[PDB]
Design a protein around this ligand. Sequence first.
Ligand code: ZX0
Ligand code: CL
Length: 362
Amino acid sequence: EAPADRLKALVDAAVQPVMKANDIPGLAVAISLKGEPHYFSYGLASKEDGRRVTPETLFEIGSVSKTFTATLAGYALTQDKMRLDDRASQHWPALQGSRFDGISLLDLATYTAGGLPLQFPDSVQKDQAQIRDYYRQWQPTYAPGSQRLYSNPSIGLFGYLAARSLGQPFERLMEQQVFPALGLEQTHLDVPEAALAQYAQGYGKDDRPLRVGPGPLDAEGYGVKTSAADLLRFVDANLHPERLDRPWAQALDATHRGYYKVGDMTQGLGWEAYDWPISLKRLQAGNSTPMALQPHRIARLPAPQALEGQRLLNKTGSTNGFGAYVAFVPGRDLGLVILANRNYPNAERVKIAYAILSGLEQ
Ligand SMILES: *C(=O)[C@@H]1[C@H](NS(=O)(=O)O)CCN1C(=O)N[C@H]1CCCNCC1
Ligand SMILES: [Cl-]
């Protein structure tokens, strides 16, 4: 019983102090190790009705959704419906004559379009015309392809245009094609009524209840609600794309290609990669507020780099009431998911993950 005992002891030791310190009501861990899933569930999905977290509890994953968006784009790309060097306006006539004539799909996907902001301004509602108008009027702060500024409207437009290239709405493609191709039956953009009992409550300041509301390009940027078990299934698809039908294998591979570096981080479609091993402090810095909020000059690669082998691929994501983190090591067939119903600092999420990964190495 030693191995099961040791894994429980390790995950408990990593998770419990961080949950206490960040007053996290409920937290789900899922780990893929040596080809088997392992689940560890903590606390409450809802403090008020006493629903406990399980591996089936649905959490908002926020920007981790971008890795799903990237997978749909990978499908469009490897199906020859778009190319990364296409100008954005090729895929939406509304953008012809705008600055998007001079901005590539790759620029949008990797946040280098020239200063698209972190979020849509509050003045832009979930409305196709308002979104249209927003992009039509937007002007770059600096040359496209030169600086990374992490941005929902940037990758949101990338996903929206990938959907246009496939001739169907983004949301429909996700529900009808992407999630089924990945074997995901507990993963939603719009949680069905019959599944609402599984949907955790989110918690903010003074423990106010917070579930995510509608916003422009929400599906593309931050729309996914999923369970720890389903998100680990997605990690396993990423660890083994060859286990999927060829078109989807290629779609996943397209999210494992790096285009430039900023500091220790290599930017793919959705996924962000680090050499492994690397220090906890460096991994935290790559997932820090200044990394997200400030423009960084890029070091472009001479050719796309395979994000595999001795690397850690990760993504953080948050909503007002939730905080998610996913990390995997391709060359070790190892992955983990940490989902919580409080938006707690990225550094703390990474701290839990690092403690688990370090302990599995020891
Ligand atoms: C993604 O989660 C982005 C950003 N990602 S990061 O943690 O990698 O920097 C953190 C917040 N964020 C959002 O998408 N925020 C949305 C949260 C939903 C409520 N308003 C829309 C903004
Ligand atoms: Cl936004």
